[PDB]
Write a protein that binds this ligand. Structure first.
Ligand SMILES: CC(=O)Nc1cn2cc(-c3cc(NC(=O)c4cccc(C(F)(F)F)c4)ccc3C)ccc2n1
Length: 350
């Protein structure tokens, strides 16, 4: 039942894919992989095919490959990216070297929407509602996104949203340096390595995205890590004794204590004309102490989403076994586990 594969060179990369995928066209490249737009003749869908770059070159790369495949195979929610297909041209484990992942082709992202269109409060309500509905699902599987930003949120013509991770490069220090969107939505505990972070790092990002949908502007466009921290503390206030004790890094803790103390600002005076319910929700998401930050499940029940909230239609994920994360294996073992996952893949129904 193995399909027939055909080969083509696209931007000095050899692509070998089943015949069902036609009109391959390059849409992106990076350290982790290359992405092509294509037409799936079997389903009639416009798809995105990601060919992973050297997926088993090191233990780190082999584990990352296995990790992404496990995660994609698990995600089954209206607001989260789904795996349409996974394939390899390899006929056996011995010849296994390449992995291709297929998802829906995404049109616009949230950055394209905020660009020329000024969003109304009802539009903001619907977009944030869906992010939180998708996050509640991601978090219920004990998965932390870590990189929620407008470019990782796909929004169709009907304002239907999906959470994705379209990143193709290594999230290095250099990539996070300066006046960069890669760091503007990051929680201060992850950006400054304050302590062992939890999934509320993602709620900080939603708060940053919501503020930007409401004003059309970046909430914390820092020119560097320290300038961004100062922009944060000006709005939310400098931390109290309770939070400083939770900063496990003595160096980071010592730096914060050197700053002049500042009170939390009045958010109604920052977000002029915004719905007072939006302002209230923003104050619950943009909390410096991650332990006190509203969760996705708590946020869906907030009065700001009264028009969309349906507790009978906000599902949680099936149990997700990620015991593999603390497993020490050789490249060939991570490869064989990846291979079993490719061959056991069951496509979703129409
Ligand atoms: C115009 C256009 O459509 N361009 C486009 C489409 N693209 C699609 C992909 C793409 C991305 C993944 N991986 C993830 O999304 C991912 C990984 C980990 C966690 C999560 C989360 F679930 F936590 F979000 C999601 C798998 C397969 C493909 C094909 C990459 C770049 C891209 N560019």
């Amino acid at each position: 039942e193995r399909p027939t594969f055909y080969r083509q060179e696209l931007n000095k990369t050899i692509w070998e894919v089943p015949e069902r995928y036609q009109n391959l066209s390059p849409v992106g490249s990076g350290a982790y992989g290359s992405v092509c737009a294509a037409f799936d003749t079997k389903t009639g869908l416009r798809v995105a095919v990601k060919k992973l770059s050297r997926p088993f070159q090191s233990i780190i790369h082999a584990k990352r490959t296995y990790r992404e495949l496990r995660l994609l195979k698990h995600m089954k929610h209206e607001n989260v990216i789904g795996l349409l297909d996974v394939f390899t041209p390899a006929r056996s484990l011995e010849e296994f070297n390449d992995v291709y992942l297929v998802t829906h082709l995404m049109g616009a992202d949230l950055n394209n929407i905020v660009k020329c269109q000024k969003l109304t409060d009802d539009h903001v309500q619907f977009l944030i509602y869906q992010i939180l509905r998708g996050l509640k699902y991601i978090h219920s599987a004990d998965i932390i996104h870590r990189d929620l930003k407008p470019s990782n949120l796909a929004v169709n013509e009907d304002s239907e949203l999906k959470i994705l991770d379209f990143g193709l490069a290594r999230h290095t220090d250099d990539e996070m340096t300066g006046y960069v969107a890669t760091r503007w939505y990051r929680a201060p505990e992850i950006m400054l390595n304050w302590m062992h972070y939890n999934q509320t790092v993602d709620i900080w990002s939603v708060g940053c995205i919501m503020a930007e949908l409401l004003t059309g502007r970046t909430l914390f466009p820092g020119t560097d890590h320290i300038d961004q921290l100062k922009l944060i503390l000006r709005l939310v206030g400098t931390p109290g004794a309770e939070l400083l004790k939770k900063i496990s890094s003595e160096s980071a803790r010592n730096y914060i204590q050197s700053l002049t103390q500042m009170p939390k600002m009045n958010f109604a005076n920052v977000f002029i004309g915004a719905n007072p319910l939006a302002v209230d929700l923003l104050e619950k998401m943009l909390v410096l102490d991650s332990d006190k930050r509203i969760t996705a499940a708590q946020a869906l029940a907030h009065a700001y989403f009264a028009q969309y909230h349906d507790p009978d239609d906000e599902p949680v994920a099936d149990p997700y076994d990620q015991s593999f994360e603390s497993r020490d294996l050789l490249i060939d073992e991570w490869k064989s586990l990846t291979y079993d996952e490719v061959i056991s893949f069951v496509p979703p129904p129409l």
